[PDB]
Write a protein that binds this ligand. Structure first.
Ligand SMILES: COc1ccc2c(n1)CCN(C(=O)[C@H]1C[C@@H](CC(=O)O)C1)[C@H]2C(=O)Nc1cc(F)c2c(c1)C=CC2(C)C
Length: 216
């Protein structure tokens, strides 16, 4: 792979992301002004934990399906073996969802997009786990600080998935091949866009995985 070939990979990954992002960035930002009323918030808080779990579990399952679609469209993911493809997605899909979530988070008012409008963390009071929820809001808030480009998310979340340190892989060498090219793609693009400053500020990939191991 030469350097013009790396730009095809970058473009490819950015378009796979564009297709599989579920929520359009334009739409998310326009909806920010559309925020749940105190009456509506109370409505959600009045609900059973069980109903909130079903709604949340539904919406996030859908979210995972979109990540799987993304992965399927990455160059050479489908060329991996079946066991490896599952290991990578089992370990990485939820992590990608958590990173993608920062686009739906408005740091001005500490709110997140949920069922058509923006709500604070008190929306999910019924679930009875503010530990998990504030820490999801905190993580989203810190990624908000970076003002991630769409392409930066695409490239970064591709590297979240394609990680040859996941235990269970049968073809480590094959997955390193992709990881290494994707790393070059990411680093190259950050040079092209004078955004090398963000490498020092991305969260550690240990800490991405530890907030999902606790999740479960
Ligand atoms: C990852 O990027 C994102 C970010 C937000 C959402 C999605 N994906 C998926 C779709 N989605 C929707 O609301 C759907 C649009 C559909 C049709 C409609 O009505 O427009 C309804 C969002 C969502 O699920 N919000 C959500 C869920 C959730 F579980 C939590 C939080 C927030 C914050 C704390 C927790 C409890 C973790």
């Amino acid at each position: 792979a030469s350097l013009t070939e790396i730009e095809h990979l970058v473009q490819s990954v950015c378009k796979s992301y564009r297709e599989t992002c579920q929520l359009r960035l334009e739409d998310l930002l326009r909806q920010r002004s559309n925020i749940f009323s105190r009456e509506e918030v109370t409505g959600y808080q009045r609900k059973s934990m069980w109903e909130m779990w079903e709604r949340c579990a539904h919406h996030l399952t859908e979210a995972i399906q979109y990540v799987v679609e993304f992965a399927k469209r990455l160059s050479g993911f489908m060329e991996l073996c079946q066991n490896d493809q599952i290991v990578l997605l089992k370990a990485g899909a939820m992590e990608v969802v958590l990173v993608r979530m920062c686009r739906a988070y408005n740091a001005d008012n500490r709110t997140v997009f949920f069922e058509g409008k923006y709500g604070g963390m008190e929306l999910f009071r019924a679930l009875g786990c503010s530990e998990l929820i504030s820490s999801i809001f905190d993580f989203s808030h810190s990624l908000s600080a970076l003002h991630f480009s769409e392409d930066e998310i695409a490239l970064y979340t591709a590297l979240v998935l394609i990680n040859a340190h996941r235990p269970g892989l049968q073809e480590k060498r094959k997955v390193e091949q992709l990881q290494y090219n994707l790393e070059l793609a990411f680093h190259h693009h950050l040079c092209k866009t004078h955004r090398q400053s963000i490498l020092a500020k991305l969260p550690p990939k240990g800490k991405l995985r530890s907030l999902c191991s606790q999740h479960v």
